[PDB]
Design a protein around this ligand. Structure first.
Ligand code: MG
Ligand code: MG
Ligand code: MG
Length: 167
RNA sequence: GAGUUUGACUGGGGCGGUACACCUGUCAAACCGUAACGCAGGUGUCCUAAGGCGAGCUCAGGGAGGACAGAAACCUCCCG
């Protein structure tokens, strides 16, 4: 039945910078040029002396795309990765992700003002009906025979993009 | 030189301690109450919100994941 078709719920991009300041506000404009929307700064939960991060200090930026624009950014991300992901990239909960080492390959032209940054592409899959565990009125679990496994996630990647999955 | 004062509790007194005004657990023996210089601790503060109300949200931790990134940075899902 068509009520089991795997789809892209959201594409969550993450640029975790080591420190704040001008170095962080440059990465915010990178996600704005790619996702076309204002990013969200993530403050540090705790303080780490070795990492050089203080509590409640913005160190990262993240976005999330839902509609056809999420498939656009994923296609540009999978093109840089040559449409091949390792078998361990797929989580047992049905999701997967990969890392991009430089945003210049995604379609953003390099400029001397802002530096080069690496993103963190993570795709959250789902079936039509996965919203029952997120709504407030009459919330319910998804179900055993309806949640996506690791096998269906890898098979979906080998069919929509015909990607290669290395052992 | 004159007058007066130089606390109390206290296994004598002094020294020490404050059991001297208060709070929690226990002692305490299933109502309450109940002693010892019994036991283990706290108090002379702090807060324009850490008061009041409404709304949304869910925590600790763990599993699986995801460029740098690692036993600990951030993103995601699941259990909780
Ligand atoms: Mg006399
Ligand atoms: Mg006496
Ligand atoms: Mg009693």
């Amino acid at each position: 039945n068509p009520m089991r078709e795997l789809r892209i719920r959201k594409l969550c991009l993450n640029i975790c910078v080591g420190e704040s300041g001008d170095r962080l506000t440059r990465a915010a404009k990178v996600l704005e040029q790619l996702t076309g929307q204002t990013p969200v700064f993530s403050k540090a939960r705790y303080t780490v002396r070795s990492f050089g991060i203080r509590r409640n200090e913005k160190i990262a930026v993240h976005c999330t795309v839902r509609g056809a624009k999420a498939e656009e950014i994923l296609e540009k991300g999978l093109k840089v990765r040559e449409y091949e992901l390792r078998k361990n990239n797929f989580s047992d909960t049905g999701n997967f992700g990969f890392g991009i080492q430089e945003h210049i390959d995604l379609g953003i032209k390099y400029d001397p003002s802002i530096g080069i940054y690496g993103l963190d592409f993570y795709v959250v899959l789902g079936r039509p009906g996965f919203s029952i565990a997120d709504k407030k009125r009459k919330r319910g679990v998804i179900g055993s025979k309806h949640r996506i496994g690791k096998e269906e996630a890898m098979r979906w990647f080998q069919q929509k993009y015909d990607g290669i999955i290395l052992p």
